[PDB]
Amino acid sequence: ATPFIFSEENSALEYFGEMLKAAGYNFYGTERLYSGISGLELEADIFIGVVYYQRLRHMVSDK
């Protein structure tokens, strides 16, 4: 994920979409989610992935 390694010719979304297509997933990162409250398949096509989160030290116990 180094910056400036993807140009406009070889896009990043084209690259990682071809990776997801090779894995048998959607090219655009979305999946068919269902509703856990309703049981029904949601009409939209929901973008899901793996993002690396950080926990900041600002807690409500100190505030």
């Binding site: 993807f6 990776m19 090779a22 894995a23 048998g24």
Partner: protein, 51 residues
């Protein structure tokens, strides 16, 4: 040894080293560009849907 004042000089020679430029003026030698990211070979669908 009277040390009289002589005439004005005609000109000036000036000796100094010259650099060698047989090396430079060549075609440039840049750092080679890193390759764009290419998809790995042998990517298969590992996940099959349940049931």
């Amino acid at each position: 040894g009277g040390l009289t004042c002589a005439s004005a000089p005609q000109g000036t020679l000036r000796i100094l080293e010259g650099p060698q430029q047989s090396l430079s003026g060549s075609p440039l030698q840049p750092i080679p560009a890193s390759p764009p990211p290419q998809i790995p070979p042998g990517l298969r669908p590992r996940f099959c849907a349940f049931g």
